[model samples]
Target: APPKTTVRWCTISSAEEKKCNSLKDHMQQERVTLSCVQKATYLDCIKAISNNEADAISLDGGQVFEAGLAPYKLKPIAAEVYERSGGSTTSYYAVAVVKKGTDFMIKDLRGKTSCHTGLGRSAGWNIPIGTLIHREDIEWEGIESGISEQAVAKFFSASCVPGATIEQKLCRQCKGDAKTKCLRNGPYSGYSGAFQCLKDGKGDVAFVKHTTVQENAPEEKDEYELLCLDGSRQPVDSYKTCNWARVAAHAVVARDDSKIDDIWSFLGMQAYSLGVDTTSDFHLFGPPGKKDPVLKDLLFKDSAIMLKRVPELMDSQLYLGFEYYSAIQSLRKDQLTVGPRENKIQWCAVGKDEKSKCDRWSVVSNGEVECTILDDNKDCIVKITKGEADAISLDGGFVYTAGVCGLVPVVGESYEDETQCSKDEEQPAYYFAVAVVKKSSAITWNNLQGKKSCHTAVGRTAGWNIPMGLIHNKTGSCDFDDYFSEGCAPGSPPNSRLCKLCQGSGENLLEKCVASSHEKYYGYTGALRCLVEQGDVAFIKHSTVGENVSGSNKDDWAKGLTRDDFELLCTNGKRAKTMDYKTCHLAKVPTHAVVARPEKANKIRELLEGQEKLFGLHGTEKERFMMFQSQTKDLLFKALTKCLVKLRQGITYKEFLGDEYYASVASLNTCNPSDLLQVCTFLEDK
Candidate 1:
């Protein structure tokens, strides 16, 4: 407070502090301070703001855009959140697991009770919850006591080994750690306390996120087996969640308000190590009284004030949990506190039994729930999770199958930064993998034939701009018999159509959609996110209505909860979408059928002129080509028939289909010969 010489920088979590290290040193030279408190969450700093505790809070960009938290008042002081690599491209995502055979798949669980523990915390909660509320096509109602209890019961029961006695029925973990053999249990038993809950009977699925399942698992631990919709393993290459980093202007967000001009200004600056921890141990100490100063706390506490407190906070827990949610991975969970006074370590708040009460411990309301801590319960009980409840409505029935790969988040090659690949060459086929959703009702491979196909529909050098674009799945061939047996893998998995594999450099793999078979593809978890979005985009992109805008972002669909984000990529908004696509391309979509309608011939002609089309080309262009072909067909047939009229003998059906015949008159399959012979046909009368 002495002359306001430092930059009060408050990170939502301690893991974030590492990102600020260099800044501390640079600011020191300028006689300025770059203060970063360890493990501080947006919720914590928001409090700091109100109590005049800090000046700037690092809020994820997605939260600002999606959640209504301070949307109106806060403006981005910095545009690049993670400038170390030059910019922030990750939107860390949370995910839930729906063991091998359950209707409560990730998508189905959207509008039901999702047991996401960190939904309210800035790092654990805000972004994902915002995405769910803002992106998913579902409703989020916190735990339904009876049903929640039942679901957890089933989940735990499922984890128990098949031969285990009735007494072991409710255990959360499967014996022998064969989680894939039971309910929705993570393959990694190293999660410590969380795994104990599995043995104590929790829920059917683990409501977590991408980083939680993929990167968080210990390197030595066995990977959790993710069963896709089609009965195959979820790949680690294609499917991905959005990553959001708190970007800022980096300049005058503090008391001094002038030294640095923008966030980019701190780009190459070195950081100085600072002690972490505020007076409240690793927790945030809030102001007490009937005034309930929580709101007052958020506005005033920016990142700068907290930055100065880093060194002190690091004393107790070398890595302070008091920072932002992602600040440092220590003891983290947000319980709705009850006490009127807030303290990061002591009394917290909680929302138990309808009314919220004041309690101890940090009450971080991750966007998943609107929980205000009611009691200061440090050993927080019942963090109550919520999400949509998906039922196996298609029980035993044949359904369309499609799969998608998880987007790989590598070093300089995070998911969104896929463009960073060698530009001279095309983005790896796996990176540009295709996702197909087949609509069918039969379990037989034949039934899957005509089912509707949904894909990225982005134009390419492949076969049809549609399914023909290098159809690769982690699974071998998405044939009927292949599902439930073969798994997808390698750079391109063999067993199933789309297997989880990563072409990107990182060791982590992602879920990729393979056109192997129906069940294997559609069954994967993220596949649905992609399938849902792609299917919706296909319908919207082909249709004449809806915004279905183009570009890298297909996130914003329609207005209101009615319009849901396509989720897979950025196609539709929120309400409801049946397909996802950018344009009418080389392949024909239903929209193409509609465009093919005679009435729109003129309209199609006009719309077909300009910019590059994605999948199918414009109508006028196709029309003219068709006209030429038709006219040529008739003329060629006439000319050939005249020659046939001169001949007496005719050719056989197999002969016409044979390569020898084509080679004699014209080369087979070659561009020149194929084109020449296509123009020369034999007469039917002959």
Candidate 2:
């Protein structure tokens, strides 16, 4: 049993405050204490929660995204489930509602009077406007300069977009006058109000949720239609197919360290006592009074039937889904601008060493390949997704994320002895994942429990995913942190046992457990070194042992290590020679590959093929600067890479990583949640 505590719920309006006070008084009788904190806006509530002045608040999807940003790292603990005529759902579809007999399609919305729920609303401003931008229907080149609103004001002749007070044209169709005009209490605000604005003939189209038309004008439902993306109109009932985006439902958010379960438990009790159909004096989902039209959806949406607990592992990004999150991110003015570089391919390089190699490659290739240095592999993938960079070579684990971001594989790193590049169909590129241990150690696969383990990085295919996936499969648990007593797995939580053995590189030694090369134990070579120094076993690619042993690597640690000094831990609970990886290893996975946007896939492949002729293994400029060689192992491309092989046209990341390997990595994701993987998977499903 926990001690009694009060949850301070934030309110944005006086009506909401009144409702909160009523709930507070009612819950006090049941020994569940509640407090109401008033703020001017949802953004203020986010700040209050972050500052620990407030405990929780219900926020729209867009507001949830904003609150999830830096400084205010709040997460949705519970989502509002809406009761529809068809079924219950935790999501709503954004639709462009237009009066029937209007011949114009979505592309012809320009010069039209539009009605919006409000500025910053998911179904209203973000989804519709973002869809227009995504489809190239509205060209706003100044998006990075914060002119998207002005662009919309110019595109639409008039709009009842409440909260867009700065744009006069946006408020032209709004009915409110004087100080109340275009504000939250205005005549043309919120879903029902925006629908009324369109119904009153003030606007040609209303951007609102699927339930808006049915809830506001059920009698006139047959008189309206939905504008589809394919330049056609469908009945309002076809919203599931014609909607701009499926928006996540409103959620109750709290600070990262808040007692979320306690809050949810209190709310659960309140719902049972004061929810709809109850005789209680206060209703949890209702407004302060029946006559206050402007104060509807005060604390929770009136349409919400129940509050559903969000998965404990889900964060804001995961809750909002990728397409919706990306759409919201597109509206931000701080987003990087992507332009036509036509001839040059901007390669996203991770870390300082990769950047140096890229710069040298750029000069050698006569500026054919420009370099964009990012913090790490994930950052590179994000840059490529935003079109800020053209391409990046990613391990199979990152390839899954790249694919989820709609990136396509251009070429794969081939480790075979073939000098010439072959098509993917001619030869499938792959490498073995192995667990290397000292030859004298008694450690075996079955006896690895509680032993110190080394991983290249948290999510890398060979190091973390394959080995961890096997462990998870055997143990039926996701507690990898406890499986090993103490070890170095770069990208794990900085203070976790997984990062206990990581030796931060450089003078200050501050970048502990970072996924980038700046951390001493980051990649295959680093994990191998971890094994040689302290770890009982190192999860790495098969060649990692041979590549640095017997004076092959001049590093101080690898000076006298012989290939015969280490052995492979097979899944059969037996040990084998280091050279027996093919028969005794964890999982065989696809080689790292360069991923690019579909539009530049062929161009990137051509550029790399041409550049390879001059700097590849036997290239004329091999003496000057080798494209594949790095001081540290696997910098830009793996040191063992002989050439880059072209994948077949239309090859997806799932296809590139064979079903067996893809499933292996995916299984690991279940135990270890990745924001990128979750977002990408959500977006891919959409």
Candidate 3:
């Protein structure tokens, strides 16, 4: 293809327009020509770029992701590298700094004014909003909108959050004309604008990047303080010790098919010389005019050391990490709705079966509950982050993913005995991660040389991690498909022994090896069924045998069997009765917990506890229906659970799973769970 010569640039700010005009003049002098297009907002420019009205634009990492999504197949082309005191880096921390001695924490941001760079930018809105929404008790219903952004608006009393003028409260502090007030064209909009909000006392806290204060008001360092996650306040200079999160930097994006050979040449020449080292009296990357440091960072980041190419493949989610991307989704809820119907909590389910149960859950709650479905745990998490779903009942492993994505545990499934025994008794707060074998089986923990096995998917704690992890550690190898002669460990490859013994019947053979409920032999009961009907050994949770065989569950897999027909395999090489799970199990792992987006967490607990009272095992409606039971499988919620209890604030997955135990699971995990998943998998058994 022949290279196209003219470079069409999209502009968002008046300062950027002037910079582009200056570049146009410079290119004209150099015997080349540049075209500039202006848009009213960041999203407007994105639309312009997609329609080929413009060829390129520099935007927040979060915005680049949005621009790259649907209709606009644009990709990140160049990135801004910022300078730190020690050196330079392509990333920075998203921090919320308050005036020192404020005597409060992140949890205290409620009813306080918050300053943001703009509605959809990284660092200011995405980072801070992302981190805070996951924290418990920030108050989502304080406003009337269904979206998370409104929750943030209501969480704070008032302040400057530019570019979203449609929401009157979001742009309340932007000091400018009505038409331009909430736009980036507003007086206080970007990094400097957000800092200016704090300086003018319009906000109690400013959500900006690490170097913002140093760049704007270096003289008053001691006057500000950093808000740490631990609820402790630290000096302004202690950002390393106290910050919301580390986030990716901004990028310049362009159409993937655009021929910008000359444009790249222009940027390469201006990379170092655009702002400071230039021979021309013009400054493209700096403040607009000679006397004013008033309006800074027109088209690029102010502290940017240089411009480097962004990898073409790095989309927003990949570039911004889970936390930041989730936050951007929260702020960009352009179709937000407000009403009593919006108050309904939308539950996230993985498959059709889960979806059916969610439908019943919504019906049971008389519409207080709602349902949305994704293919599996990962997509469910993404849905919750996107504000499409409110909460979900997730396994221990998936709970960790939600935690890291900034969601939290509202309640834990309590597996109380018939006698209503306290969780603190010999039963403990955790469930036993057990291995089950038929009564006549000769296989012990010591004699598993060629025995067939079944697992509740690969990454799940009890089903696969504990059993397979133990074996992998003992044998010191990852070739587990060869270790067990032939078995169904869902999520394993189609050609492996993990799928050799699977009896799942459907058109798709691969579905037989999936990890979700879609696969017939997937979890504790599924593995146990595999053992009883197909395999020699089953990796599962403690109550699997009893919960299935002892009249609690009447499915064909267990209706004819007795709990006495099964035995448990202890980690220390002894086999014992299924009833003696406290002594015979492999490990006491955490239980399944209900995870929800931060805004919906409190209500999730509210509806769940209330629903349990009505649909619980001994509940009044138990005769007509049960919310946690099923004939073919354990429905949307687990059946063995006794009740729901709020997990104390700050309790983590590590506390429930234990460090040594978690380390074992981590080592055996083949798929790399997200950072959020790793931390969230730790349960709040307390």
Candidate 4:
């Protein structure tokens, strides 16, 4: 793939094509070739650029949003900087302008005659309408009847929202008659036209950028005032303090795989030579001829002072920012609608074992719950974040990752007592990360350097993170693979010594070292079984020994195992009875939590509570199905979990995990970098 040299510029109109041609000829002297590809509309240009028929096109913030969606996948390569912005930034304030004599504020806009630049525009429609909705000033009932535009039409007595075809009330203040009225080419369209409507007494207020009033009515600017959000009026120049939002400026959009540097260099050089202040033969910011109002912002915005190259990783959503992007989405009809699956909570399950348990739970809930199967917990977190799945119970280590990725914890597993299903007094959810070993073995925490070990899985609270983190702190080395001569840590590389002791379940040997239950040595119970078979030590929770020993588990591997056969390896290099885990464990950590998107947290809690009442450990229908008890060991919820309790209000993962446990878990990152951690860190900063 050779670097692209010829930059194909997409032009929307004949005037824009003429300006592009002039730019093409000008850039030729600098050894940069530019090709002008004409299209009928900006949307057509977006399609052409996406199809590789054209390479680049400057688009408004709203159009840039559309180009960034679905099949187009365009990104903002460079931003057009305005002269009044003071620095190399591409943002301008959106203001509500009205006659000086108007006694109404922004809160009093209901039933008023309004003018807007155009329907679906950034400043005109999105900013104003979104701000009103956010402030609860406008009541947009639902998307079934109509969209935000219908609510806007009802809010205002009459409006001149050009390009609006559905709502007649939105076009009632337009000066143009029947055929051309409310169209993009109508008399009362665009910024200048919207301001003209207010000046001509057709509208009481105009929604446009801060520069509109000064550009259209420079001498009479003082005759206009800005409606402040604080329920007061300020002079037009006070838009700096009183505005709806800082809207993003126009930007050059290109295909995701396009040669962005070439496009930026060409635009940068052209702006430096033919900018507004430059005395070139053809002005880049000027109209095609004689400052014609219709030809005014051809090829680029007339107010742009220069073109600033965007960051290499900058996409349309990053360029527009969350506030502006969310505002635009709020006005879309589809974004407001709840889908068919809204009533049911989608539970993400890991492996076939959990999926089978989830299917049974879904049947018991009478279709109030659904299941989505994935490879592991990490995939479950990713799916839940992307809205493909609604909820998943995650270990503390993964809860931190999920929280960083913007998911919130709703309920936590409570393993307080064996007999009590639900306690009246609320207690903090927690468990001990203990290292268990056979009483016959002489291996203690101090002399277990070369001992064969067993772990539930990589990145698990007790199995991997806690034990490995402790080893790294003691030895100051992240090489856990070398610390133990051989071990069975599921999810480790199959050929590595860390996975040498892994045993595949049944006859399917290919499932060896997998992070799921298909692997024989994969979880707390499995790891304990490994200790019984081959391993010298196993890292697990405090209650794992009690749950599987003394004939409690009828499995072939643990038929006659007793609690007295195993002992806890204390951090002080001493072996203690299995029941002394409270003082001998490596760390006290929070229990596994059910996490989901913030908006869905409460709903997930409700669904889990409803299911718990029917299928929990002490439920009336326990004979039919049990959520806490699985065919094997722990499944949907931990086998030892007595009940599901709501998390503290507004508790984040860091807060929930506490400082000591979070620091110990996070310390392990230095020796073992995680793919999820890197992505979550990047997205958090972005």
RMSD to native for every prediction? 28.2, 9.8, 10.6, 10.2
Q: lDDT of each structure?
A: 0.27, 0.81, 0.70, 0.80
Winner by lDDT between candidate 3 and candidate 2: 2
Write the residue-wise lDDT of candidate 3 on 14-85 in tens digits. Answer: 777877887787657542357888878989888888887887888876578788788986777776776647
Q: Which residue window of length 10 is worst by lDDT in model 3?
A: 677-686
Worst 10 residues of 4 by lDDT: 333-342
User: Which one is best on lDDT?
Assistant: 2
- TM-score versus the correct structure, for each prediction: 0.27, 0.59, 0.56, 0.56
- lDDT score, candidate 1, position 587: 23
Q: Write the per-residue lDDT of candidate 4 for residues 1-686, one digit (tens) a residue.
A: 23438889988788789888977877576645799989898898888987888889888878899999979999988777765534555666788898998789876988899999998777788888876665556666466655445667777899898988888988788887777888887988888998999998988988888889889999989889999875778898887657775667788989878687777877777877877767747787763345767678888887777777666555676566544665676666333423323577889999998999989988887888989999988788777766679999988878888887778888888886453234542644576788899976578898989999999898787898888888877787878899999999999998789888888774365787899989988789899998988899899999899999998889998988898899999888888899886678888798888898765777787887888788786677888888789898788888877788777565788888876577777778766557666555544422
RMSD of 1: 28.2
Model 1 / residue 295 / CA error / Å: 28
**Residue 274, candidate 2: C-alpha displacement in angstroms:** 6.9
State candidate 3's TM-score: 0.56
